[PDB]
Design a protein around this ligand. Structure first.
Ligand SMILES: O=c1[nH]c(=O)c2nn[nH]c2[nH]1
Ligand SMILES: O=c1[nH]c(=O)c2nn[nH]c2[nH]1
Ligand SMILES: O=c1[nH]c(=O)c2nn[nH]c2[nH]1
Ligand SMILES: O=c1[nH]c(=O)c2nn[nH]c2[nH]1
Ligand SMILES: [Cl-]
Ligand SMILES: [Cl-]
Lengths: 297, 303, 298, 298
């Protein structure tokens, strides 16, 4: 078996988990953006694999250096603009690059407040969902930017059921019109090539849409007839309220909370003590796109 | 080097025997009409028995199954609710001590799952929540037979960072000391804080926990308009402990552990830039720690 | 914005991390296979999402029940055969299923040995690389089976360099002809529709090829001029020695081991003390396929 | 509330997770020891805490430097000897140190074999329980060494029950004479001041005692009437066979494997499919010491 008998379907390399903090000072007031960056390249040749020839390979160490240099020279107005700047640098600098993908997540530092007063230079880690983005470009193709939020755990204690599902000989699940709906969410949305707007302002607005659609109104909530329907309500709320979102993917990993039978312990448990099942767990996932955007492709 | 082909129970002392149930996870739901309230917890309850027959003789006559420990925790949560994790820990220890004469010692550890109520435009949602881990609340109750019931509270996985008003100077130098003196650096810490109330059990446990948490953040940061210089991680640990002890009389003993991350100002001279504290790279490993336990002299003497 | 303005690009649901142990007894001798199973479905409609109508949804709870029933009735001769049996069950049973994918990994239990004698019923967890497989089928499509090994950490202390790479204004890396080569490997290979052979025997043979190709001969080793070349040597060794492998993906996550500069501490470190960099880390990935197999997929 | 009203019970600082590999070459043949080291100090004063005065503080950075220098100068024959060398360095060098504790664990690298031949410079990670040790010394006190094994997951599929336990109104557990006994073990033992023997030889012997006592003989095994009794059998086997062990702590975190009721799915499960409960989980812990060693601590 030689190079003649085999096809190269895919080659990809890069640098993962480049961690750094970009500090910005407006007099005594300090601002931080701490990020984790992964940048992957596909080269137009595979001589490093096929021939043991490294002439075209950009060291992963150089990828790291370029990420740090760009953060120093340009600052980080948004992780999206930083991801764009990194992909642009690789495409305009190195003709051996066929494809570049940059992934960035924010370390979720918040400014400390003492009795409602913002601290000039003190922060606390508050992971209430991780902000990320992804930029990718093929040689002479569109630079496509996605933003998202992952590890976002939302729970409501009622206005959730699952009824009228397909029944067969291996279906023991009872019908329920009241249950805890507890979800870990992964949400990712494409802007396509739109790059004009306030990335931070749009991300916050999408996040608000996710929480509002999940919960329903604060005085009464809204019935969810399935995890899948709640995923749909979230996607349709984002697309209704945020025109810059062209495509939205939502993944919901759920935890069932079991009302433990306490009859043998001599008491009745009227939805008072509930035990979460972490494993195994259900997931559902949907990607919706605007007809207009998909046609214009 | 030995006179016997084996050891027997005659040759050995039992220094410690302990068993129990770990990570009992449940949510206690309370409804006031349409408004829902949640407390989700992880409970560990350990016992020492007055005998070790289950170990030494293969005789289980006195062993309370770990399964029974779980059942008792769930029954108490259903019957009593959870006003505070501390009161729940107390109720569990009290149940074991008053119910089973074979129990020499009981320890209950509880941590809260950090659920917060969702808000829409300042309006609290009746039944919707979001996980917000800004430091994990825990407590610990323990009692020996005929001893005091002692309650501790704490906060762990609390990661705080300030970007200035931190240095480390005038330290001991020797042939293996290459560390430069610094009067400006990032102070980034993961905190473990635990404090003893001793036998004090009268007060609002939630109100006191919040007050200690505020003391930790305020002492770490200094005032919001200017901050406060830290000459070492150790000194910051001291400022935190002395702030809590000054402001919260119910705290008798306080342990603080600070695991730090150095943020290195990357040398970029070879890349053709000067980096004036603009790009900083954290060292996660290896990491420094310091730990201190302070107590009130009067409380430690009276014991 | 309404259902009229929007296209459903993709819908997928399932049950993740179904953990169970299948126990088999031959008199006093016990055999165990403990696995983690994930089974995902795509349905032919999306009424559960679009209309709030669950008529076609097979509960994830039923997916779990089916996995456990199949393990009880059929046993687990191999995780590959089990993955196949699960996908076949979903396709032949439920007309609303457009697509099924089953992922399985083995919990790496080994039998305990006392002085070379196998214990009848005692085991130890030894994670020296996790065995996994994947089966998938579209309605009216082929049932495709992949096998793999992940979390396999291999290290050699010499016969590794990286020289003659592209240099630019942001390149500070020195050329090195001696360094530690330390890799965490993810390897996945396709059999396509081939289902006749001993799955366990072929998996073991691929594993041997990976270790031998990584190391070179035991008396001298073999120079690696890059992580990428070592990935290639592994793939070409597997394809040369195992005809059932049609396509092979290898991902190598590396750790650099730095020779600590100790000049300021008053001693010289001649590749004696080395500190691993866990983050950031380099990765490279390649998928090779047999021309013959890829053509015959027109 | 002032410094006068407050007592310092305890002050401790140090450097955690110092990761490095010590490489030794005998011609072509390479030998590796990769370790994670934590070294903690208590100082004789607390001026750094109480007064903001760092004059006596040995930087944690200097603790790291000392660990790397000692590994370079002395090599690592055993992690126990390395732990001893580090504690001895701090105690003989720095009069501000009242107490030093060094914890070390081995990265479980094994030499690769190709057709029965040990590879000169190639290794695979095989975590079959993590080897660790601990050395500590007070000023004017003994240097005490502990060794151990953690993350050791052992399982037997029979010869395990739990019967004749205390029954009360909240006890629903059935009596069982057959069940899976699955345990994650933490084992730590003290040698006290004994330092004349081969550390590697004794650690291997203790490990063999743990596996043999857990499993019983390979042709029949041995009935366990509780997790606690199995912990006892392990401790008494170590103490019987290894005179250098003065004190032994064993912690057993168990997982119940439930025989899943499949009656409603139309089949009977005769201990064929078992589902582990990871949470909540039971634990038991015991520390045994020799009477003779505890007396001789007058
Ligand atoms: O909302 C639900 N959707 C599902 O697909 C499912 N499966 N089991 N329970 C479920 N609940
Ligand atoms: O504040 C500090 N305390 C220490 O003990 C130390 N060691 N290195 N750097 C340090 N900084
Ligand atoms: O073998 C290597 N390949 C790479 O792509 C690389 N980048 N830095 N070092 C490297 N070594
Ligand atoms: O061996 C056992 N020991 C215990 O203490 C226990 N508790 N429940 N089941 C048990 N089994
Ligand atoms: Cl076998
Ligand atoms: Cl060499």
């Amino acid at each position: 078996v030689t190079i003649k008998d085999i096809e190269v379907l895919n080659c990809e390399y890069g640098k993962n988990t480049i961690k750094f903090l970009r500090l910005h000072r407006e007099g005594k007031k300090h601002f931080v953006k701490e990020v984790e960056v992964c940048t992957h390249l596909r080269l137009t040749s595979a001589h490093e694999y096929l021939d043991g020839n490294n002439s075209f390979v950009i060291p992963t160490d150089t990828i790291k250096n370029i990420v740090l240099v760009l953060a120093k020279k340009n600052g980080i107005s948004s992780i999206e603009q930083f991801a764009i700047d990194i992909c642009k640098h690789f495409m305009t600098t190195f003709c051996q690059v066929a494809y570049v993908k940059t992934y960035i997540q924010e370390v979720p530092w918040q400014r400390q407040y003492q009795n409602g007063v913002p601290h000039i230079h003190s922060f606390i880690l508050v992971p209430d969902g991780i902000r990320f983005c992804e930029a990718e470009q093929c040689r002479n193709g569109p630079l496509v930017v996605c933003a998202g939020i992952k590890d976002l755990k939302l729970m409501k204690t009622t206005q959730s059921g699952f009824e009228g599902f397909y029944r067969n000989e291996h279906t023991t699940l009872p019908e329920r019109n009241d249950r805890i709906l507890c979800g870990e969410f992964f949400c990712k949305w494409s802007y396509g090539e739109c790059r004009d707007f306030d990335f931070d302002c749009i991300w916050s607005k999408v996040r608000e849409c996710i929480l509002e659609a999940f919960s329903g109104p604060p005085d009464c909530g809204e019935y969810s007839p399935s995890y899948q329907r709640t995923v749909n309500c979230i996607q349709m709320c984002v697309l209704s309220r945020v025109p810059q979102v062209q495509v939205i993917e939502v993944i919901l990993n759920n935890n069932f909370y079991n009302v433990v039978d306490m009859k043998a312990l001599g008491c009745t448990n009227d939805k008072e003590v509930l035990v979460p099942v972490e494993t195994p767990y259900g997931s559902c996932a949907c990607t919706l796109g605007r007809k207009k955007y998909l046609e214009a492709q």
